[PDB]
Design a protein around this ligand. Structure first.
Ligand code: K7J
Length: 224
């Protein structure tokens, strides 16, 4: 997260991290005791999932191995359309005041809504700096018509743009798959942006969760 501040302690109990061993790979969100939602571009053969602490690296965090994951069938490794994936935990997450299921949306929040995006990704770019504490920034949803002016053919329908005018506040490497929450529901998963991160007036681009709830539910049903 570029130009953020630590998230409020205990306010992100549905945030997880996907690790390669104990190295950050991506963010994610806990959907239920057996499933994490993240970005398809974060696909690996196996993952370690961190839950239950705002401190990445916390010796007391819950850690669960995950062997199985399923990208949206429409995902492209070229364009990153449909950048979402479900990761199946090998054992059930232990829920508590610090480990909670995210609230998936019924509806799509409109342009101009204020939202919060979180993650443990780099706070600097191109030279990286990885934080210990979960970082947050508030960003506003940008309409497709406005966002197309910037990204043109790179933007496809189920991508949602968000940012703050003239601001570096944004997502960056290591934040993918983490949550963009607006008015109490999960509206986005971090997907992509420009490089170096934090260029003013280059929106962050998110998978628009309100377009994928049938696939999310159907896939979880199918796999257990
Ligand atoms: C995987 C996830 O952690 C990461 C999150 C992220 C968010 C914002 C900025 C950078 C990274 N997502 C990515 O790494 C995605 C998926 C692979 C490629 N990718 C990108 O966001 C890359 C960095 N974006 C680009 O290549 C964009 C489309 N082009 C440019 O940035 C060109 C130059 C420019 O205008 O500055």
């Amino acid at each position: 997260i570029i130009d953020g501040a630590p998230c409020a302690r205990g306010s992100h109990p549905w945030q997880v991290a996907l690790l390669s061993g104990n190295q950050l790979h991506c963010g994610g969100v806990l959907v239920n005791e057996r499933w994490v939602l993240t970005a398809a571009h974060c696909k690996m053969n196996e993952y370690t999932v961190h839950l239950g602490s705002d401190t990445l690296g916390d010796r007391r965090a819950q850690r669960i191995k995950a062997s199985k994951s399923f990208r949206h069938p429409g995902y492209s490794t070229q364009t990153h359309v449909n950048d979402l994936m479900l990761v199946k935990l090998n054992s059930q997450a232990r829920l508590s005041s610090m480990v909670k299921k995210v609230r998936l949306p019924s509806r799509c929040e409109p342009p101009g809504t204020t939202c919060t995006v979180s993650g443990w990704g780099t706070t600097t770019s191109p030279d990286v700096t990885f934080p210990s504490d979960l970082m947050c920034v508030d960003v506003k949803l940008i309409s497709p018509q406005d966002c197309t002016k910037v990204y043109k053919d790179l933007l496809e329908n189920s991508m949602l743009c968000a940012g703050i005018p003239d601001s570096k506040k944004n997502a960056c490497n290591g934040d993918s798959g983490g949550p963009l929450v607006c008015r109490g529901t999960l509206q986005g998963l971090v997907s992509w942006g420009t490089f170096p991160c934090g260029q003013p007036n280059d929106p962050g681009v998110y998978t628009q969760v309100c377009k994928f709830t049938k696939w999310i539910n159907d896939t979880m049903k199918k796999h257990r």
